[PDB]
Each structure stands twice: as C-alpha cells, then as structure tokens.
Symmetry: D5
Subunit: 146 residues, 10 copies
C-alpha cells in the first residue's frame, strides 16, 4: 500500500462539499501509509482531465474529485459528459487508474449526503481513493517483475 | 476452445450478484476446456477498462463482469457511459474481444434475474464468456495461419 | 460494381431476424454480380466492431448486420451506443465504408417489418449493402487511378 | 474573400428533393465568394458522409457535409445522428480541417423543408454551413504560417 | 498571470450575447495583466474546436465562447455534443486547457442572463477565462522548471 | 494473379534507365494478366515515398522504380538513405508491399546492366514487380477470407 | 517449455538452398520445444519480410524472419540490409512481439553456408533465432498479466 | 502551377551559397506563376525540419535549402543524418512533398558548383523547387476532385 | 535512490561477459538502496528492446546490458543498429530512461576490458546503472509534485 | 527575445568541456534577456533525449549540450547515432526546436577548440543557443495570433 504514488485533483465549485470530499480522500491515503499525496486544486470539473493527464505522467493513480449539481438548463449534462469522457480517455492513454469521485446530483442535499460530513449516508471521496489505490495495486501485480 | 487465453475482470459492488456472474463465466470457461483463466477483481465497474486494457496485452479475450444499479441521482448514467466508452475503446485499440457482461438495471430484482442464480431468467456472465470465446475463435481463423 | 470486395458481419441475437437481413444483403450482392462475399457470424451486436476491424483490413466494404430490441432495463441504450461508437471508429481508422445494417427497435414487430420479409415495409439488410457498395465505388473514383 | 480556398461538399441522398435544395444553397454561397467549381460528391445516406468527408479533407481546405435525417417510429434516429456527429467531429480534428455540419436532424418532413432554403423556408442550413466552412478556412489560413 | 499566453475563440451566432461573453473574457484577461490575448471569431459553436486546436499550438490556454439555444428540433443536442466532444479532445491532445464558455440553454432569457450583459445574473465568459488562467498557472507549476 | 491492384511509381533521373525498369515492370504485369496498372512518374527518387503513400491507399501493391548513381560528393549516401527509410515506413504504415526496384550504383555501366536491356545481366524493374505481386497474393491468403 | 506459444516463421527465397537450411533449423528448434505446426510463410526477397512479419504478429506470440542477403558489386547490399533491419525493428515494437532476425548478411556465399547449419557449418543462425523468439515469448508471458 | 501554395525554408550557414540556391528556387517559383511563396530563413540545416513541419501545415509543398560542408570531425555525418531523417519524416507525417535541396559536399568548390551561380555546373535550389512543385501537382491529381 | 523502480535486462551471448556486466549493474543498484531490481535475461542483444518496452511500463528506468563483438561479416553493423534504434524508440515512447550498456567491440579483449571482470579497466554495467538512476531521479524532480 | 521559455540539458561526460559549453549557452541566454533558463544535467549524452522530451512539454526550445569523443571501438558511432536519432524525433513530436550542440570529435584537442574557452576557434554551446532562440522566435511569428 505504502509504495504507491498517488495524486488527487479536486475542483472548487461548491467549495464546502469539495473540501469535505478531499478530507475523506486524504484520510484514506494517510491510513494506507501515504501522508504526502500530490494534491492539486482546479476551479471547475471541466479543468480536471487536463490536470489529471499531467499527474498521470508520474503517479500510479489519480483521484478526481468534485461536485456538479443540476441547475435550470442542460449545461449540467454537458459538463458531466465532458468530465466522464475526459477521465476515461486519460486513464486509458496513461494506462493509469483515474478514480471518478466527481458527484453528479440534482440537489445540494444529495451532494451533502454523499460527501462524508458528520451525518452523510456515504463518502465518495473516500470510496474513490480506495478504488484508485486498490486498482494501482492490482496493476502492480499484473505487470512485470522480478 | 482449449488453447484460447481467457481473462475475466469482475468488479465487486453488489458483490453477491458479481460472484454469481463470475460463477457462470467460470463454468462456461471450464466447460470449453479452460480450467484456470486469468481472474481479476476490481472495486467498481469504472475500474474495469484500464485493468481490461492490461489484460488484453496478454490474452485473446477478456470478459468484463459487474453490476450497476440505478439510485436517486444521475450518476448511474455517467458510470454506465464510462464503462461503455472505455471497453469499446480497449477492444479496438487491442484488436481483442471484450465481452460486456456488466449489468445495468433499475432495480436489484432485475439484476438478480440476469445473474444466473437458481430462479434467474438468464445468466449474462455466462453469455459474456460465450461471446468472448466465440469471437476469439473467429478472429483466430480470420487471421494468419498455415 | 463487380470489382469490389465485400464482407458482411451479422450477429446472431434474434437469429430469425438476423437471418433475413443477411438473405437480403446477399440478394443485393448477387444482383450486383459479386464474387461470393465474405460472411462472418457473431454472437451479439457488441461483437461486430472488432470483427469489422479485422474484415476491413482485407476488403473495400463491410456491411454490419444484426438486431437490438428494447427490454425492461437501460441495457438497450448501452448496447446501441457501443455499436455506434465502434462502427464509426472502425470505418474512420481503416478509411473503409462500414455500413450500418443494425436494427434498433422497441419491439419485435417493428424489427420484422424493417427486415425485408414478404410482408415487411422495408429491408435494412439490403439498404446497408447498396450503401456499402456505392460508397466503395465512389472512394475508388476519388482515390488514385490512371 | 475566398477565391483561393479549395472547397469540397459531400451530400447524402435520403430525401432527395431536400438534399438538392441544401446543395443549391451551398453552391450559391461558394459562387458568391469566388468559388465556381467546388468538389461535390454524393453518397447514399448520412452515415456514409464521414468516411467520404475524410477522404475529401486530404485535398481540400474545407468540407461541407449536407443531408437530412428525419425521425421515425423507432429509436434508430438517435443512433444515426450520433454516428454522423461523432464522425464529422473526429474527421475535422484528425485532418485539422473544417467540416461544416449541414446535416439536418428533424422530427418531421415539414421541419426539414423549412430549413433547406426553399422559397418559403425560414432558413437555409446548407448556405449557413458553407459560409461557416469558408470563413473558418480563411481564419485558419491567416492563423497558420505565412511570410 | 502576466506571462500566460491566452487565446480566446468566440462564435457569432446570437451576436449580442457572444459580444458580451467575449467582452467578459477580455476584461478578465486585462484585469490579470494580459493586454493582447489572441482573439479569433468563428461563425458557429461547432467551428470552435478546429480553431481551438490551431490556437493550442502556441498558447498556454484557450477560452471557448458561444451560445447554443434550443429550438423545435433535435439539432440542439447534436450541436452541444459536437462542441463538447471536440473541445475535450482538443485539450488532451494538446495537453492545454480549453475552458468551455459555450452557453447551452433552453431559452433566450436564460442565455442573456448568463452572458454578463448589464442585467445578467452571471458572466460565463468571465468565468471561463478565470478557469483557463488558473489552470495554465497550475500546469506551469506542475511541469518542468529549475 | 489477375485480381491484384498494382501501382508503379518511377522517378525520372537518368530517364533512359528509368524507362527500361518501367518497360520491364509492365511486361511482367501484362504477363500476369493485369488490368492496366496505375503508373505515376516523379522527378527524383526522393519524391517516390510520398507518392507511394498516396498510391498505397488505393492499391494492394506499389512498385518503386528509379536509379541513383554515385558522383563526387556524399549526396548519394543521403539520397539512398532517404529512399530507404521512406519506403520501409510507407509499407508498414499502409501494411502494403512496397517493392524496391530502385537501383543504387557506382556507375552508369552497372545500372544499365541491372536494367534489363538485351545485353543486361539482370532486370530489377521486373524483379520488383514479381516481388510486389507475390507478396500481395500471400497477404490476400493470410488475411480474412471465407 | 514452449508448448503453448504460437510461432510464425517467414522466410525469403533468394538463395533457395540456404533458406531451406535456415528454415530446417528453425522447425527443429520449434519441434524440440513442443511446437509441431508453426505458421510458415515464404516470401520472394528479404525486403518483403517486414510487411509479412507485421501481419503474422497479429495472430502469433513470436515471429522468426529467415533469409540471406549476399554482397554484390554495388552499394545495393547496404540498403537492403538497412531496410530489413529498420523494418523488423519497427514491427516488433509496434506489435509488442519478438521478431527474431535470422537474416544472414554476408560478403560471400561461403560465409552464408557456414551459418545455415548444414552438416559442416560452424553455426546455424535459423536455429538461434527460433530459440531467441521462443525464449523471449515465454519471458514476456511471465512478465505480463497472469492470476 | 499557379494555385499551389509553396514554402521555401533556407538555412544561413555559408550564406553566400544559400542565397544563390534561394535565388534559383525563387526564379523557378516565379516562372510557374508563384510570385510570393512563403520564405523562411533559419540558422542551420538542423533547424530545417521543425520549421518545415510547421510550413507543411499551411502549404502543399516545401523546399528545404542549405549547405553542409565537411570539416575535420565526424560532425558532418550526424548533421547530414538528422536533416535526412527529419525531412523524410515530415514529408510522410504531413503527406506533403519536402524537396531536399540541402547540399552536402566535401569542399566549398563543390558546393559553389551546384548552387547555380554564373559558372556553376548546376542549380540544386532550382531542382529542389521543380521537384516539389511537380509532386504537389501530381498528388493534386491523384487525390479527390470532380 | 531507494524509491526508484529499476529493471535490468541482460542478454546472454558471451555468457561470462554479460554475467559480469549484470553483476556490476546489480552492485550499483544495491549500493544505492535497491535490494530487488527486476532482473530479466534474454538470449541476444536484439531481444532487449521488446523486453525493455514491457519493463518500461512499471519501472522508472531500465538498464540494457549485453555484448556485441565484431566477426568476419557485416552482421555486427546490423545488430548494433537494431539495438540502438530499438532502445532509443523504447525510451521516448515510454518517456522512461533506458540506459545503454550494450558493449560494441571489434575484439574480445576489448569487451572483457569494459565488463568489470576482475582485470578490466572499466565496467559499463556499473556505468549504465548510475545513468539510469540519476536520470530517473532528475525526471522525478522535473515532473508533477506538490 | 525576452519572452521565450528556454531549457538547456547538458551531459557531464568530459565534464570540463561540458561546463565550457554551458557557460557560452547561459551567457547567450542572459544577453538576450533570459537570466533563468531551466538548466538540467545528465550523466551522458544518451540520457539527453528523454530529458529533452520532458523539457519540451513546457518550453519553447531546448538546447542539448555535450561532448562525445571517439575511443578504440565503434561505441562512439552508436552513441552518436542514438543522440542524433533521439533529438530529431523529440523536436518533431513536440514541434519544438532542439538545438544540437553535442560535440562529436576524434580527439580532445578538437573538443577544446570547439567549446569557447579563451583560445578556442569556436563556441558550439553559444551557437546552439542562438539557433534555438532564433528558431523559436521564427515559429512564434509563423503560428497563430492576434
Ligand atoms: O445483437 C444483440 N441484440 C440484442 O438485442 C442484445 C445483444 N445483442 N446483447 C448482448 C451482446 O451484444 C453482447 O454479446 C454482450 O455484451 C456480451 O458481450 C444483448 O445483451 N441484447 C439485449 C438488449 C436488451 C434486452 O434486455 P433487458 O430486459 O435486460 O433490458
Ligand atoms: O441520410 C439519411 N437520412 C435518414 O433520415 C436515414 C438515413 N440516411 N439512413 C441510413 C443511412 O444513413 C445509412 O445508409 C445506413 O444506415 C447504412 O449504413 C436511415 O436509416 N435513415 C432513417 C432514420 C430513421 C427512420 O425510421 P424508423 O421508423 O425505423 O425509426
Ligand atoms: O453557435 C451556434 N449556436 C447555435 O445556437 C446554433 C449554431 N451555432 N449552429 C450551427 C453551427 O455551429 C454550425 O456552423 C453548422 O451546423 C454548420 O457547421 C446551429 O445550428 N445552431 C442552432 C441550434 C439549434 C436551433 O433550432 P431548430 O431546432 O428550431 O432548428
Ligand atoms: O465543478 C463544477 N460544478 C458545477 O456545478 C459547474 C461547474 N463546475 N461548471 C464549470 C466548470 O467546470 C468550467 O470551469 C467552465 O465551463 C469553464 O471551463 C459549471 O458551469 N457548473 C454548473 C453546472 C450547472 C448549473 O447551472 P444553470 O442554472 O446555468 O444550468
Ligand atoms: O533475400 C534477398 N537476398 C539478397 O541477397 C537480395 C535480395 N533479397 N534482393 C531483393 C529483394 O529483397 C526485394 O525483392 C527487391 O528489392 C524488391 O523489393 C536483392 O536485390 N538482393 C541482392 C543484394 C545484392 C546483389 O547485387 P549488386 O551486384 O547489384 O550490388
Ligand atoms: O548479444 C548478442 N551479441 C552478439 O555478439 C551477437 C548477437 N547477440 N546476435 C544475435 C541476436 O541478437 C539475435 O538473437 C539474432 O539476430 C536473432 O534474433 C548475433 O548474431 N551476434 C553476433 C554479431 C556478429 C558476429 O559474426 P560473423 O560476422 O562472423 O558471423
Ligand atoms: O533519382 C535520382 N537519382 C539520382 O541519381 C539523384 C536524384 N534522384 N536526386 C535528387 C532527387 O531525389 C531530389 O529530387 C532532390 O533532393 C530534390 O528534392 C539527386 O540529387 N541525384 C544525384 C545523386 C548523386 C550525384 O552527384 P554529386 O556529384 O553532387 O555527388
Ligand atoms: O557524453 C558522453 N560522451 C562520451 O564520450 C561517452 C558517453 N557519453 N557515453 C555513455 C553515455 O551516453 C550513456 O551514459 C551510457 O551508454 C549509459 O546509458 C559513452 O560511453 N562515451 C564514450 C564513447 C566512446 C569511447 O570509448 P571506447 O574506447 O570504449 O570506444
Ligand atoms: O460496479 C459498480 N456498480 C455501481 O452500481 C456503482 C459503482 N460501481 N460505483 C463506483 C465506480 O465504479 C467507482 O469505482 C467510482 O466512480 C470511483 O472511481 C458507483 O459509484 N456505483 C453507484 C451508481 C449508482 C447509485 O446511487 P445515487 O445516484 O443514489 O448516488
Ligand atoms: O547549415 C549548416 N551547415 C553546416 O555546414 C553546419 C551547420 N549548419 N551546422 C549547425 C547545425 O545546423 C546547428 O544549427 C547546430 O547543430 C545547433 O542546433 C554546423 O554545425 N555545421 C558544420 C558541419 C561541419 C564542420 O566542422 P568540424 O567537423 O571541423 O567541426
Ligand atoms: K502512470
Ligand atoms: K468527508
Ligand atoms: K490480445
Ligand atoms: K450464475
Ligand atoms: K486467414
Ligand atoms: K479496406
Ligand atoms: K430479407
Ligand atoms: K486539408
Ligand atoms: K437552398
Ligand atoms: K500566423
Ligand atoms: K499549448
Ligand atoms: K460581459
Ligand atoms: K515540476
Ligand atoms: K493498400
Ligand atoms: K527492361
Ligand atoms: K502478437
Ligand atoms: K539447418
Ligand atoms: K506479471
Ligand atoms: K500540407
Ligand atoms: K542560383
Ligand atoms: K483521384
Ligand atoms: K515508466
Ligand atoms: K562487473
Ligand atoms: K513546446
Ligand atoms: K564557452
């Protein structure tokens, strides 16, 4: 667990939630032996993929965190298409896991309930970190040694 | 089908259903003379393509197993989108069959019914493996030999 | 149109319906004086693109045939997306017409009706092959000759 | 402004009368811009456009894709539109050439006829896509290397 | 961000709204030390991506601006899908931020309200440029220096 | 061998010698019952690969013909290297036999002798076309047929 | 050790008797390793090898390229060797498959005959390249994903 | 040849000889109806390919001009190697003719004799432009038109 | 360099000399905190590059070791050219250092003298590994951290 | 001149000379307005390309400096092939000038005479910096603005 190189890129739109997701990703990392993951912040979720690409050049895994919440127009749908499309492509070009902990909810109560705050049902920041670390460890054993 | 190299990557969300899909894939595999395919477990369906890309380096077919079930948010559609996008890409980049045996249902009852348990109407795990072995055999013939 | 090298790949799901699409593709091919076209069967529509990729290496045109009918879950939508992204990409990678003769219907009744039986209103199987051939001829002309 | 740009136009043939009317719009815009002999290729359906457009983009500064997809009783409209879309988008970026999407996607015949620039049409989408191709080809020429 | 090299590409459909979004982009650029960003016009949203690609070859970031408003037909969906797939591909291919300020609304009232016209609630032009620049700045810090 | 689509590209430097290589290529093509092959002239051997690239898009085989004779400077060596790297690469990119019928001689006398005139000991022009054709036939067989 | 590896061998035909002797070496090594039916294709000259090898590498774990290039009076030896070399090297790395270079490049016929594993030959380069292909195919299988 | 877009990139080492090569290219250009080709000067032959790659984005042909002359070290061969390698690559990646008009001599007298000055035996500058225009015309014809 | 992930690939031709170079690589690795580098053998130099490529997928650097000694024929030139082009391509494709410790000598005395056998003047195995590691370390510092 | 982003990678083999080349590159840079170019050291010249590749991701130009001197074996030739081949490829993948100031001499007096020391005939470190800066400035004017 301890020897993996991990990066976390978190957007800042709905900053409060963003910070709650990043809290659960860090804590997961630190309990697995990783106290100094590369952490980067971006403004919005659309900026995540290009930053994830840069990070995957020299980390074993990248955790993509953020919060998108449906407004009054279709813009929500296109923002979510673009992030889904970018992350999948970056993982496969780089042959590196890019864990998707980007929340996509209709409401703010949904996001708060998915973010690992004191009374949340679940913590997606923490789940996405477990996923990336576990997957990087699986790739390690599949690949060439020794 | 004795001499095809088969790999099965199954995710672990709704882990009771995933084990049943894997069970049917493993039986189909063993029935066509493959007693020990390469089997890999990942956490979540989203992780399937990058592990499947690696497995395709060393195998003639890959079977992607898992279960995504719809909740209260739009997340179900972006998860399903990433899986669909990623596997098709991997199949064409590697010119290797990747069978989609990832169930995408609305309810848990629908998934239970397509995982090949005692009272289930079908087994997609089994169908996914059938399709992957069949295609690998076809390509073998289509491609260069004596 | 006698000069063109034509492959047909037909999936087998709803095999009565796949079988009329294919009868109609071969009628059209024979009526344009074709050298016995290369025909490959596959299990499901999701299998078609990797086999089309193989076939496109050695032919001027590939007709993709099969049938997808909608059920009780979202699966239909992902199956159709996969086929669509796959064919479009295979055709551009190989710069080869990949005709889409893949029905995507709500009901069995609608599919039977577009499959060119005596009482059917349309025949997608035959339409796809005319399309294939015309596009191959056009590209012959557009490309380098004396 | 566009006397030197090499334009190609590819038009599908489903709904013949409307494709003719899109192509007339395209050739008029071209003519008015100094271009009398654009390369023009016909294909049978709109799904065939992208692979013909890709070929046209090797010898041309801009490609105009014309056609008409009209929704039926099945979901099949949605997949055709998806293929066309994804393809022309790949083709333009692979080749670093404008590929103007002049392919109508309507719910009914009435709607298509209204966007093909017939005498009483509200608009002419074939015209629009040519202007768009030609103006993007010119933009890119100034942007690109000259001395 | 005075040493950042910025380009801005604005489509022209709905001229008043674009001029406004372009004006917001440009006021944000000047307010962060950038007097002469490269500014290019195209007619429609869909032309943005190929122009963006030429601009990503010697700028640190590109802002996409334009307006898509829904009508009576399906065409809106395909315009937005095109723009989204295009700009997502352009950014990762060139490893350069393309900030998306393409408005995608159901109504004109909605679009005018997001354009930073005098009575508007927000300006997505202004917002897109803040994103471009922060991201450029982050990449700079992340990349090779010494 | 009647089925194969053959292009010949011959450079024009030492045109008497290029002209016998080409007469010998066409004799061989006609003696295998060929549909009038596509013939293109180019000015010099360095021109051949880009034109071969174009020709390989629409043919099963390309014969490259021309003559390079050594002079007083190192130029000869670079001209021959260029042609070599170009042809080998064009053939692999297009997976198409690109026969090398390009003489590379110290003197004019040696070239005339390998160019298949009555008193010549060899004919490289004719050798290259047999090679072209045989390789195209072999690949037809190796690839996907019924 | 190599019962499960799928081996292809491509051999050029210039200097027929020596190519036969290289191919005999290859098929013996294969047989002794559990492999009785390697895919074997003949091509006319060594410059044809790379494009045939590339095709063989889509359906096979290893390719053995056999042949014989013998220096003449002109510089033309040097370019043939260069093409063969560059090609088999590209083909192996593009396809992530071993392509064993069993192509002799000699100054005289005497030298080639000495490296084709005839009864009095000093060595058999056809044998060597098969062992090399098969041992690299096996290496890469352990290195690659298994469970 | 009126409507071919021509570019000439000349290096500046042995600048008297380079200007003479350029002079012959410019006259050939002007003779076939091209009065203002794109002309670019670089310092050294090694710089030619990356500028030529850029010029190929916007032109149908490119002419590479320059003069490398052998000194006391092996550097002459690696300079010549890089030029040869780089230009061939650029020509095939861009599917655009790049005429090699870079003289590679042993002495300054040999270069003076191939640069098309009053008493020179030939003009390579002129030949390089001839070859590039001729090839661009050929490809135009080979490629798609009415 | 304790956190560097190293692989070493040593060919086997001239077994005593390779064992020696491999021993030098391995003593340098241990002397810089690396107890278990991944060590793989291949038969000949030419097999190095495809193995190197598999190893570059999860190591920070790869050391190539082997011995090529010149004989009576041209073959030596083509073995060295192969190895050089292969390893150069493998490093840039994978953006990973491949340190070249493939000895290329005219005589056996020469090779034994560069192998760090007991009486040797140098050890190019030892040297190649110092290069691998410094370069890994430099890239680490140059790449994304925070 | 002042706005270009410049990197210099210098190997350390023949350290004295290496340092004399780097002195002339820095000084050239500082007189052009560039006081803080990114400077990286590598052990040998073979390590230069992979470091040059990393640097070209975010600089307008890279200057490659070093010294190779022929010894007793052909190793010199292969070291020089690999550097020539790597640098040309890195410049073209990145569309960035990579100035070659890697000296290749038969002797040490030749190197000292090419390195810009008090009594040298020439300074190649300084020439290669002028070349890269001048070329980057030329690309700036060819490319997109304003
Ligand atoms: O050609 C097909 N038509 C269909 O209607 C269908 C197919 N294939 N497949 C699966 C097939 O393409 C692949 O072989 C698998 O992914 C394994 O890789 C299908 O699964 N279907 C059924 C489509 C919808 C029906 O069911 P539900 O009620 O579960 O929504
Ligand atoms: O240009 C077209 N417009 C249309 O409206 C349409 C086309 N083409 N095609 C087929 C064509 O693009 C391809 O030639 C084939 O797919 C073969 O590759 C169509 O099939 N359509 C009809 C779309 C909807 C109508 O019917 P339904 O009632 O079954 O949904
Ligand atoms: O910037 C745009 N905004 C829009 O709202 C719109 C554009 N462009 N375009 C077309 C343009 O990007 C392309 O230049 C062409 O396709 C040719 O290449 C649009 O067609 N629109 C309108 C979007 C839909 C409205 O209406 P109805 O559905 O009623 O026709
Ligand atoms: O993380 C985000 N969450 C959101 O909810 C949201 C973001 N980002 N962005 C934009 C951002 O990713 C990019 O920074 C820009 O496009 C510029 O490149 C958003 O625009 N949103 C809002 C999505 C929906 C709500 O609004 P409306 O009421 O206008 O539909
Ligand atoms: O396998 C070969 N061995 C050789 O020694 C040789 C071959 N092929 N070829 C040609 C062959 O590879 C290709 O079929 C053609 O080039 C067409 O693409 C040869 O030409 N050779 C002879 C090399 C040297 C002899 O003669 P000269 O005296 O003219 O230099
Ligand atoms: O590591 C090696 N060292 C050498 O000195 C040598 C090798 N390999 N190989 C072959 C090997 O890398 C490849 O496995 C095969 O080509 C098949 O793929 C060699 O052939 N050699 C010998 C180099 C030349 C000597 O001799 P003569 O010129 O007298 O035959
Ligand atoms: O086919 C050719 N044969 C030759 O012998 C020769 C050619 N072409 N070319 C040039 C040609 O391929 C290109 O068209 C130019 O690069 C322009 O792009 C030649 O230059 N030659 C002459 C080869 C050597 C003679 O001369 P010197 O005495 O100068 O060494
Ligand atoms: O900059 C260098 N100059 C040289 O003269 C030289 C270097 N590097 N290298 C090796 C270096 O680039 C790499 O660090 C290693 O291969 C490991 O990757 C050298 O080996 N040399 C010496 C070149 C020739 C002299 O020796 P011989 O007497 O053994 O022929
Ligand atoms: O296999 C899965 N099935 C599911 O149903 C599901 C999964 N995975 N995942 C996780 C992703 O595969 C995961 O690995 C992350 O993206 C981290 O990279 C899920 O998040 N789900 C839930 C989808 C639907 C449920 O709920 P709401 O919309 O109510 O939130
Ligand atoms: O056009 C050139 N002609 C030449 O004869 C020559 C050039 N350029 N260059 C420079 C490269 O194009 C240059 O741009 C650098 O590599 C920096 O990137 C040269 O260095 N030369 C000289 C080659 C031969 C002379 O001498 P010695 O071997 O005696 O040192
Ligand atoms: K990585
Ligand atoms: K939390
Ligand atoms: K595979
Ligand atoms: K089961
Ligand atoms: K076959
Ligand atoms: K084809
Ligand atoms: K029928
Ligand atoms: K073009
Ligand atoms: K009209
Ligand atoms: K410009
Ligand atoms: K950029
Ligand atoms: K505004
Ligand atoms: K950094
Ligand atoms: K071909
Ligand atoms: K003849
Ligand atoms: K393989
Ligand atoms: K033998
Ligand atoms: K492994
Ligand atoms: K061009
Ligand atoms: K002149
Ligand atoms: K043509
Ligand atoms: K690596
Ligand atoms: K040692
Ligand atoms: K750069
Ligand atoms: K100096």
């Amino acid at each position: 667990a301890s020897g993996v190189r991990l990066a976390i890129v978190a957007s800042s739109w709905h900053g409060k939630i963003c910070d709650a997701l990043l809290d659960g990703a860090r804590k997961v990392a630190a309990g697995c032996g990783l106290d100094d993951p590369t952490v980067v912040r971006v403004l919005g979720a659309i900026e995540i993929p290009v930053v994830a690409q840069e990070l995957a050049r020299n980390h074993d895994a990248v955790v993509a965190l953020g919060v998108v919440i449906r407004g009054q127009t279709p813009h929500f749908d296109y923002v979510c298409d673009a992030v889904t499309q970018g992350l999948t492509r970056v993982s496969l070009d780089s042959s590196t896991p890019i864990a998707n902990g980007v929340l996509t909810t209709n409401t703010e109560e949904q996001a708060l309930d998915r973010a690992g705050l004191p009374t949340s049902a679940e913590d997606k920041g923490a789940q996405a970190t477990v996923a990336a670390l576990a997957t990087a460890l699986t790739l390690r054993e599949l690949r060439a040694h020794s």
